[PDB]
Design a protein around this ligand. Structure first.
Ligand SMILES: CCCCCCCCCCCCCCCCCC(=O)OC[C@H](COP(=O)([O-])OCC(O)COP(=O)([O-])OC[C@@H](COC(=O)CCCCCCCCCCCCCCCCC)OC(=O)CCCCCCCCCCCCCCCCC)OC(=O)CCCCCCCCCCCCCCCCC
Ligand SMILES: CCCCCCCCCCCCCCCCCC(=O)OC[C@H](COP(=O)([O-])OCC(O)COP(=O)([O-])OC[C@@H](COC(=O)CCCCCCCCCCCCCCCCC)OC(=O)CCCCCCCCCCCCCCCCC)OC(=O)CCCCCCCCCCCCCCCCC
Ligand SMILES: CCCCCCCCCCCCCCCCCC(=O)OC[C@H](COP(=O)(O)OCCN)OC(=O)CCCCCCCCCCCCCCCCC
Ligand SMILES: CCCCCCCCCCCCCCCCCC(=O)OC[C@H](COP(=O)(O)OCCN)OC(=O)CCCCCCCCCCCCCCCCC
Ligand SMILES: CCCCCCCCCCCCCCCCCC(=O)OC[C@H](COP(=O)(O)OCCN)OC(=O)CCCCCCCCCCCCCCCCC
Ligand SMILES: CCCCCCCCCCCCCCCCCC(=O)OC[C@H](COP(=O)(O)OCCN)OC(=O)CCCCCCCCCCCCCCCCC
Ligand SMILES: CCCCCCCCCCCCCCCCCC(=O)OC[C@H](COP(=O)(O)OCCN)OC(=O)CCCCCCCCCCCCCCCCC
Ligand SMILES: CCCCCCCCCCCCO[C@@H]1O[C@H](CO)[C@@H](O[C@H]2O[C@H](CO)[C@@H](O)[C@H](O)[C@H]2O)[C@H](O)[C@H]1O
Ligand SMILES: CCCCCCCCCCCCO[C@@H]1O[C@H](CO)[C@@H](O[C@H]2O[C@H](CO)[C@@H](O)[C@H](O)[C@H]2O)[C@H](O)[C@H]1O
Ligand SMILES: CCCCCCCCCCCCO[C@@H]1O[C@H](CO)[C@@H](O[C@H]2O[C@H](CO)[C@@H](O)[C@H](O)[C@H]2O)[C@H](O)[C@H]1O
Ligand SMILES: CCCCCCCCCCCCO[C@@H]1O[C@H](CO)[C@@H](O[C@H]2O[C@H](CO)[C@@H](O)[C@H](O)[C@H]2O)[C@H](O)[C@H]1O
Ligand SMILES: N=C(N)NC(=N)NCCc1ccc(I)c(Cl)c1
Lengths: 100, 347, 57, 95, 307, 174, 83, 69, 48, 98
């Protein structure tokens, strides 16, 4: 209940601050493609794919508690190396360049 | 495409299929389809044109929808049995959803509309993969879940595909669309016999793949995508016209050629189960396919169509395309009937 | 068997009360203050209780 | 599997997650572990055609543990009857 | 009782933000051989109040979609306050078992306020500026998440108060100063602070404005509080919790003041150059250090406890 | 009552789905999916899925849906059409909204309902597990097991993500 | 070898960030196999008792199984205390 | 001079001291003068709920010792 | 320094976990009776 | 079944009907596809959590990861379509009619 109360308070207050911010006494009586750039799209997609790999690494602090450490360490490094290979491929294919 | 990347993408297409075929867990089956679909899109797009982009998008939407329905069937199956083992499903609603999902992936009627359009819009080599290798993974799942499949649903899908495939091919002059509708009809034979003898499904699938690969390879050797273009073959590679004639008659199911064998054995298995009306209806309906196979033979081999003057320039250069395995594939496509009892290896 | 578990525990705590009531009370009050009830925050008091039970029991 | 490579090589690629009564981290059992175990052991090795008929009792019990339909229905009945009697003042519940 | 506690967090956060604007102006001023605000109240102590009143009685000067024009500042300010509720100082308002993940999850939502306000700007050029800002923010989210995971492999859990225990004997900045360096820079880039203040840079080449400003400056304080806990752990004495709060406040103030110090010291990055700093420099090192910090506890037998 | 919190969240879940499924401007459709994602996390949280719930926020909302909105602003819609101004969208939205309310009314009135299939209506709390006193999170133990039991899952998943990078660079090079 | 050192000096001059990344990543892969302490990580994890140690029914032929926690038989953690 | 920057820093520091100091004192007030009980895992929640029943007043932070034996 | 402290933290966790193991039989004995008492109480009301 | 399954199953059906009844924007149909995934994630998580199927706790994450990768591919196709015609309208993807 406490977290729900905290969230409701934070955003309820934010709503109220926006309210009075827009309405105070004034005292007066009188879908195309946005110049599409492919490079910014690939940044977003690259972030997504790296974000999914981060999702796979987040369990690592718990995984280190296993007795199967031989398997666990090998798979942890394997995942990170494959992430590095992804970066290396994008790098060498000019995917990190902002010219042209 | 970089040649090394093309190899790795081809291997990923194969790996996704292999994962589906070796998995005992439903999640891994789903992963195999996801990986396979991811790797095939780049070879649909490789020639970079609006038609190839439309085909890749139409393909993506169909396969993604089918994979969502498959995951639904898996999750419903988990709820009602508490396990993921790849086998019979434990809930009739799950069975219908998986059957419909796999029918969509195979392009069976009435989920067939994408097959002619996607095949037309991609290169011949990509269409070769689409209409042969891609049938392996869904058919291997159907091989394992068939005990729980609704008999009326599967036989209705089969009958519709044989009719739609047969009728759809009659109106085609594009070779890729002829192969697409031919593929739809042949899928119907494969699923019609599956409830009775899955072994005969495997036999039909293997032979279909062999003849389909032969035809695509022969189209690729001459860069022919239309009937009229194929009609110039006699004035360039006369041997090729004879091979095309023999292969088409085999795909028509004419004895004594290899393509008679799957239809012959499916009719046997269905009659052993007192199914007489259905096999007879299927065999007569397959005459539609024979008609538009015969039409191609008339314009390719049994008559000489008009030529062009610039064709003479082609007489001075040899075929340099790989035509890999073509001599073996054509002989298997036509001359295998005397070895029919060898089907027991598939048992 | 569950009832015997209860009887053994009650007799266990009756022996602490008889002999080491005061050192034990200081010890578990020290534990009770911590939000995680940590042993490592109470080593002095644990030592007094440990020495009392060893001496008298 | 269509090709049972796992059994041929003895490698466990995905069998470990197929059923809930398999080995779990820190021996954490599933809620229906005993029902799954009984059903699996009843049906083992006889084939699904036979098991559908001969292991129906174990499977019906297992499905009850999984989705708890009969239990919820029975509770629905007792609660519905209790509301009726209280609405008629014929029943007072204890503390 | 709990509602009082929430307000004893919300109100001081907004007051701290107000007076950070004064501290920033005066610290920058003295580094520039001048004074900064010193007329509006003694030593400028009423300057934030005058600025706040002024902005709120200013004319509130068409949106392309009213719902998103109002959503963007509510999201920004609401999310910013939410990031504070799991912070242990030393006791959190909400004690989350996965508090670190919660902060990571909530911070990833903050980019929607940028996106929504760009959509509501009704201007092609403001939408493009918003998309450039979003690309920067998500780029530096990558290293922040990986750096955080690397540190937690020494702490053992996603609970923020466990970082206190992990640093009972020693600050984590000593075993992890290479990560501390990239973490600190990543926070600057994440908050669009100089030399990564490209939204205000590239742009020039009332109440609603104030609300976005409060959200950003609350995030700046919060990020430096997070940095203090992550790398400069203060010792907690359960019988004298105020001792922790004093020491931990001083560290957070100094870290915040170093944000101002850095603004005063360097020119701005080009957009492509700050992208290369991330994708070609920080990310390679972060990946290598993530592998290293996975291996290190195992190879030293220094794996922390799960609990 | 708070005892029906999961059901109430599930009701909101459906309305958000009717929101974007009637397909207004993709700007608003994206908003409807974000609200459903947050509500979907809340449902998962109340079943003990703390880590799973936060992954929806971190990955589904903070990653995938951010990229969806980024792409929408860049290649689909830059200015949203007024919500429900289209007749089909308004009709589809109203049609789905009424179906949900009729479902919710009956299940709450009778504490059960048959919408094609039979659903109990006593509250999802009734099926919960009655014994739990372990010193760990079972969800965390299961997820952590990916690195000990799920070697094969890691290999195929990691490979697919690498091919995702390779494939997308091929697709977009044109 | 000399060609190896010349290559390393070149990258050290032009790309020290990448050189450091690869060196750190190489140490992470290699050092666990060379470390005498890696074996204790396995032992400490196994020694942490998450669930209850269910006792065995005594059949009279288990001289290696302790009867009481403070009896000498059974695993000892003395190696862990001194660590 | 630079030390005229301090008054603004002092106000900021007092504003950031209040949340932590308020939470700690509110916890003691609400939990019988002790730290608020942490229950991140089912075992700790089980003990806290058992404490509530044993307390006799429905307060998990009211402790009973050997006086109840 | 981190290796030494984390090793001590592992020893402190084991001691905490062993305290739980000592108490588990008593808690299990109580949980059984509480569950059976509740089921028995639910049974009296069903009969009525 | 439990009461929650009604609405979660309904949500999938709503998004499935949304996906099968296209309008104009291809993006709108992609959102329905990701809505389907979301309802699948929630239903799978609920089943796995409630049954205490410990090792299956990772399955919703795998589903999320692969489905996000599929969505990334779909978004790439959408931008390529948008580059060709200037909109993501599905009525433009009708060349293969003939
Ligand atoms: C029982 C049911 C009915 C019978 C079922 C039979 C099934 C088919 C059996 C396999 C038949 C494969 C073809 C036989 C080889 C004929 C071609 C040949 O002689 O190539 C010699 C080959 C090169 O010949 P070539 O001059 O390039 O001409 C190629 C042909 O045009 C042909 O080139 P290609 O492009 O068509 O490729 C053929 C070959 C690839 O080309 C090769 O390199 C020959 C490899 C054939 C291996 C046969 C293995 C059969 C035993 C299985 C174990 O493909 C393979 O690797 C075979 C798989 O020389 C070798 O290097 C020998 C292989 C060394 C290993
Ligand atoms: C529980 C199950 C789930 C229930 C869902 C609850 C609702 C929640 C939302 C679900 C998503 C709904 C998505 C609707 C949508 O976006 O489609 C837009 C779709 C096309 O969007 P549009 O581009 O704006 O064009 C509007 C018209 O189609 C006009 O476009 P036009 O250019 O084609 O104009 C000529 C017009 C010609 O109209 C006619 O001639 C039809 C007359 C047939 C008389 C019989 O064309 C049509 O009407 C096409 C449809 C013809 C009927 C197809 C046979 C069915 O418009 C509609 O069809 C509106 C129908 C919405 C009704 C929703 C009913 C849901 C029930 C599903 C079955 C479940 C049963 C259990
Ligand atoms: C038994 C049937 C075996 C069939 C083997 C057929 C080999 C392929 C056809 C040979 C013709 C020469 C050739 O290279 O094939 C074309 C195609 C390569 O494409 P291409 O346009 O030539 O250039 C690629 C660079 N982008 O080649 C390919 O890309 C390979 C596509 C065919 C792979 C699927 C074969 C069917 C499934 C076989 C399983 C059998 C059960
Ligand atoms: C054994 C048990 C299994 C039994 C099943 C039956 C299997 C039979 C089918 C086997 C597979 C087909 C193999 C056919 C080989 C064809 C080779 C041939 O006969 O020559 C083709 C001929 C050569 O022309 P060219 O390349 O230019 O060289 C000569 C230069 N003037 O090119 C030409 O001159 C073209 C002439 C016009 C085409 C007339 C076609 C009618 C003849 C058909 C023969 C093939 C049979 C097809 C039906 C099968
Ligand atoms: C190179 C320039 C880059 C600029 C980056 C900005 C750097 C700002 C860093 C600010 C932090 C400096 C430390 C301020 C100390 C404040 C007073 C204090 O806390 O003293 C206590 C400390 C030792 O105590 P303690 O922190 O509790 O450590 C025990 C481990 N838990 O005593 C030890 O000092
Ligand atoms: C402390 C050191 C002491 C000295 C002795 C140490 C010896 C042991 C260490 C040996 C390691 C040597 C490896 C060095 C390889 C560096 C290769 C290189 O120089 O690549 C640079 C180049 C990119 O440079 P670019 O800017 O695109 O072009 C130059 C135009 N101005 O080419 C590129 O495209 C960059 C390479 C591709 C990107 C790969 C990124 C690495 C992967 C990220 C994770 C890091 C590794 C795993 C973790
Ligand atoms: C942007 C808007 C802000 C969205 C906020 C998202 C809320 C996510 C909270 C999840 C954090 C968490 O895991 O803890 C909160 C609590 C569980 O506490 P936890 O410590 O993790 O585990 C149980 C006790 N050991 O879990 C709970 O308190 C249950 C809360 C369920 C209701 C949340 C519904 C959110 C819907 C937003 C739309
Ligand atoms: C592109 C693919 C990249 C894949 C990269 C994979 C890299 C893997 C490198 C290290 C893998 C093994 O790493 C480490 O090796 C030593 C070898 O003594 C193992 O052995 C060590 O730990 C085990 C515990 O399991 C002890 O029994 C043993 O006495 C000890 O020496 C470790 O258990 C293992 O953690
Ligand atoms: C296309 C990619 C080609 C590369 C193919 C690589 C295949 C790699 C297969 C990895 C799995 C190998 O086989 C499997 O390995 C792990 C350890 O490693 C073992 O798993 C072991 O650890 C966990 C923890 O309990 C459990 O699964 C089990 O208790 C134990 O056996 C399996 O018992 C073994 O069957
Ligand atoms: C943070 C709490 C602060 C509490 C302060 C409470 C004070 C309430 C009295 C506010 C008086 C504001 O005074 C008024 O503000 C509005 C702001 O647009 C100004 O502007 C207004 O008037 C001008 C013409 O004069 C109009 O063209 C304009 O559209 C209108 O906005 C006025 O020129 C100013 O006279
Ligand atoms: C194409 C639609 C796509 C959207 C799909 C929407 C989700 C569908 C959810 C299906 C889950 C319900 O599935 C259904 O549940 C009931 C509950 O007992 C089962 O049970 C029902 O039929 C069997 C018949 O022997 C008996 O149990 C009983 O008569 C009846 O209760 C059904 O056998 C099962 O098919
Ligand atoms: N960037 C600075 N430090 N100076 C500055 N002019 N800040 C903006 C001024 C401001 C905005 C909102 C509020 I509420 C307050 Cl009180 C003050």
């Amino acid at each position: 209940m406490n977290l729900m109360l905290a969230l409701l308070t934070n955003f309820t207050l934010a709503t109220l601050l926006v309210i009075i911010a827009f309405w105070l006494p004034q005292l007066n009586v009188y879908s195309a493609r946005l110049p599409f750039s492919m490079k910014f799209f690939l940044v977003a997609i690259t972030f997504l794919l790296f974000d999914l790999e981060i999702a796979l690494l987040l369990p690592l602090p718990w995984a280190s508690q296993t007795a199967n450490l031989n398997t666990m360490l090998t798979m942890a490094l394997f995942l990170i190396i494959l992430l590095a290979v992804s970066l290396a491929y994008e790098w060498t294919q000019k995917g990190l360049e902002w010219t042209e | 495409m970089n040649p090394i990347i093309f190899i790795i993408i081809l291997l990923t297409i194969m790996l996704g299929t292999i994962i589906v075929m070796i998995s005992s867990h439903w999640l891994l089956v789903w992963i195999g389809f996801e990986m396979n679909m991811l790797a095939i899109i780049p070879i649909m797009m490789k020639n970079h044109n609006p038609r190839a982009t439309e085909a890749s998008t139409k393909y993506f939407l169909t396969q993604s929808t089918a994979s969502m329905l498959l995951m639904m069937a898996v999750i419903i199956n988990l709820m009602f049995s508490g396990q993921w083992t790849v086998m019979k499903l434990f809930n009739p609603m799950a069975s219908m959803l998986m059957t419909m999902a796999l029918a969509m992936k195979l392009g069976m009627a009435p989920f067939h509309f994408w097959v002619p359009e996607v095949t037309q819009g991609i290169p011949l080599s990509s269409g070769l993969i689409l209409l042969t290798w891609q049938k392996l993974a869904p058919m291997s799942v159907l091989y394992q879940i068939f005990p729980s499949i609704n008999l009326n649903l599967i036989l209705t899908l089969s009958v519709l595909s044989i009719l739609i495939g047969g009728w759809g091919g009659l109106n085609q002059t594009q070779l890729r669309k002829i192969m697409a509708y031919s593929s739809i009809a042949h899928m119907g034979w494969m699923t019609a016999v599956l409830p009775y003898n899955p072994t005969m499904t495997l036999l039909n699938l293997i032979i279909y793949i062999i003849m389909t690969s032969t035809m695509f390879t022969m189209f690729m050797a001459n860069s022919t995508t239309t009937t009229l273009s194929l009609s110039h073959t006699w004035n360039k590679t006369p041997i090729m016209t004879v091979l095309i004639l023999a292969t088409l008659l085999s795909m028509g199911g004419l004895p004594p050629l290899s393509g008679f064998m799957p239809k012959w054995m499916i009719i046997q298995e269905m009659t052993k189960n007192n199914s007489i009306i259905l096999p007879t209806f299927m065999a007569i309906t397959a005459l539609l396919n024979l008609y538009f196979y015969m039409r191609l033979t008339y314009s390719t081999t049994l008559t000489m169509f008009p030529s062009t003057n610039n064709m003479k320039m082609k007489w001075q250069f040899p075929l340099m395309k790989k035509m890999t395995f073509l001599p073996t594939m054509v002989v298997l496509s036509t001359m295998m009937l005397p070895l029919t009892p060898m089907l027991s290896v598939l048992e | 068997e569950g009832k015997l578990v209860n009887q053994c525990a009650l007799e266990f705590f009756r022996q602490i009360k008889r002999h080491c009531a005061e050192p034990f009370t200081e010890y578990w009050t020290c534990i009770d203050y911590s939000g995680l009830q940590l042993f490592r925050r109470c080593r002095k008091q644990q030592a007094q209780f440990d020495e009392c039970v060893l001496d008298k029991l | 599997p269509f090709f049972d490579v796992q059994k041929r090589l003895g490698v466990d690629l995905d069998r470990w997650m197929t059923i809930q009564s398999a080995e779990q981290p820190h021996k954490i059992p599933s809620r229906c572990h005993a029902f799954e175990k009984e059903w699996i052991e009843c049906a083992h090795g006889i084939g699904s055609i036979r098991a559908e008929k001969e292991c129906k009792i174990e499977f019906e019990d297992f499905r009850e543990c999984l989705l708890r339909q009969k239990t919820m229905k029975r509770l629905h009945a007792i609660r519905r009857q209790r509301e009726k009697l209280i609405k008629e003042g014929k029943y007072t519940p204890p503390p | 009782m709990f509602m009082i506690n929430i307000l004893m967090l919300i109100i001081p956060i907004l007051l701290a933000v107000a007076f950070l604007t004064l501290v920033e102006r005066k610290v920058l001023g003295y580094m520039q051989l001048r004074k900064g605000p010193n007329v509006v109240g003694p030593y400028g102590l009423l300057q934030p109040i005058a600025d706040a009143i002024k902005l709120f009685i200013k004319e509130p000067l068409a949106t392309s979609s009213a719902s998103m024009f109002i959503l963007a500042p509510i999201m920004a300010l609401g999310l910013a306050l939410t990031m504070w509720i799991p912070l242990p100082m030393p006791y959190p308002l909400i004690n989350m078992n996965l508090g670190v993940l919660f902060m990571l999850a909530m911070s990833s939502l903050a980019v929607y306020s940028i996106l929504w306000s760009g959509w509501a700007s009704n201007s092609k050029y403001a939408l493009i500026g918003a998309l450039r800002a979003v690309a920067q923010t998500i780029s530096y989210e990558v290293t922040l998440a990986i750096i955080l995971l690397s540190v937690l492999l020494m702490s053992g859990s996603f609970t923020l108060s466990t970082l206190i225990t992990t640093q009972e004997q020693m600050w984590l900045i000593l075993p992890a100063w290479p990560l501390a360096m990239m973490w600190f820079i990543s926070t600057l880039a994440e908050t669009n602070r100089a030399p990564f203040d490209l939204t205000e840079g590239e742009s020039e080449l009332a109440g609603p404005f104030a609300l976005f400003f409060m959200a950003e400056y609350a995030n700046i304080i919060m990020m430096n509080i997070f940095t203090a806990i992550l790398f400069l752990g203060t010792s907690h004495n359960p019988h004298m919790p105020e001792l922790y709060t004093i020491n931990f406040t001083i560290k957070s103030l100094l870290l915040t003041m170093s944000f101002l110090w850095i603004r005063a010291s360097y020119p701005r990055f080009r957009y492509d150059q700050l992208m290369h700093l991330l994708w070609k420099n920080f990310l390679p090192l972060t990946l290598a250090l993530c592998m290293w910090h996975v291996s290190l506890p195992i190879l030293t037998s220094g794996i922390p406890p799960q609990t | 009552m708070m005892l029906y919190i999961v059901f109430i969240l599930s009701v909101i879940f459906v309305m958000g789905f009717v929101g974007f499924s009637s397909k207004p401007s993709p700007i608003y459709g994206g908003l409807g999916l974000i609200v459903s994602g947050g509500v979907g996390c809340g449902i998962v949280l109340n079943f003990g899925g703390s880590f799973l719930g936060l992954m929806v926020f971190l990955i589904y909302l903070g990653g995938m849906m951010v990229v969806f909105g980024y792409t929408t602003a860049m290649a689909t819609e830059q200015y949203p059409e007024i919500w429900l101004s289209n007749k089909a969208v308004l009709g589809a939205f109203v049609t789905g909204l009424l179906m949900e309310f009729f479902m919710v009314y009956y299940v709450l009135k009778d504490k059960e309902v048959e919408v094609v299939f039979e659903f109990n209506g006593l509250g999802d709390w009734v099926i919960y597990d009655t014994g739990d006193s372990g010193f760990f999170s079972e969800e965390a133990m299961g997820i952590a097991a990916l690195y000990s039991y799920g070697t094969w899952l890691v290999i195929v998943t990691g490979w697919s993500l690498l091919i995702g990078v390779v494939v997308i660079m091929e697709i977009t090079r044109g | 070898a000399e060609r190896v050192a010349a290559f390393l000096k070149n990258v050290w001059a032009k790309e020290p960030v990448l050189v450091a990344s690869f060196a750190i990543a190489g140490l992470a892969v290699i050092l666990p196999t060379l470390s005498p302490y890696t074996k204790y990580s396995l032992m400490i994890n196994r020694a942490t008792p998450y669930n209850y140690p269910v006792p065995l029914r005594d059949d009279g032929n288990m001289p290696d199984v302790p009867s009481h926690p403070q009896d000498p038989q059974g695993p000892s953690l003395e190696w862990l205390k001194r660590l | 001079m630079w030390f005229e920057v301090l008054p603004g820093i002092a106000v900021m520091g007092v504003c950031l001291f209040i949340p932590g100091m308020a939470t700690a004192r509110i916890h003691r007030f609400s939990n019988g003068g002790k730290e608020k009980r942490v229950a991140h895992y089912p075992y700790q929640w089980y003990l806290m709920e058992r404490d509530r029943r044993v307390s006799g007043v429905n307060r998990s932070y009211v402790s009973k010792g050997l006086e109840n034996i | 320094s981190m290796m030494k402290w984390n090793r001590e933290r592992r020893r402190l966790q084991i001691e905490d976990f062993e305290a739980r193991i000592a108490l588990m039989p008593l808690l299990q004995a109580e949980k059984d009776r509480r569950v059976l008492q509740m089921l028995r109480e639910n049974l009296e009301e069903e009969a009525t | 079944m439990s009461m929650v399954y009604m609405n979660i199953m309904m949500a999938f059906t709503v998004s499935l009907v949304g996906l099968l009844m296209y309008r104009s924007h291809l993006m709108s149909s992609l959102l329905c596809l990701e809505g389907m995934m979301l309802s699948l994630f929630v239903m799978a998580a609920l089943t796995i959590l409630n049954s205490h199927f410990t090792l299956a706790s990772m399955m919703p994450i795998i589903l999320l990861v692969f489905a996000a990768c599929e969505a990334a591919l779909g978004l790439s196709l959408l931008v390529m379509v948008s580059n060709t015609y200037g909109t993501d309208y599905v009525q433009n993807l009708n060349l293969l009619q003939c």
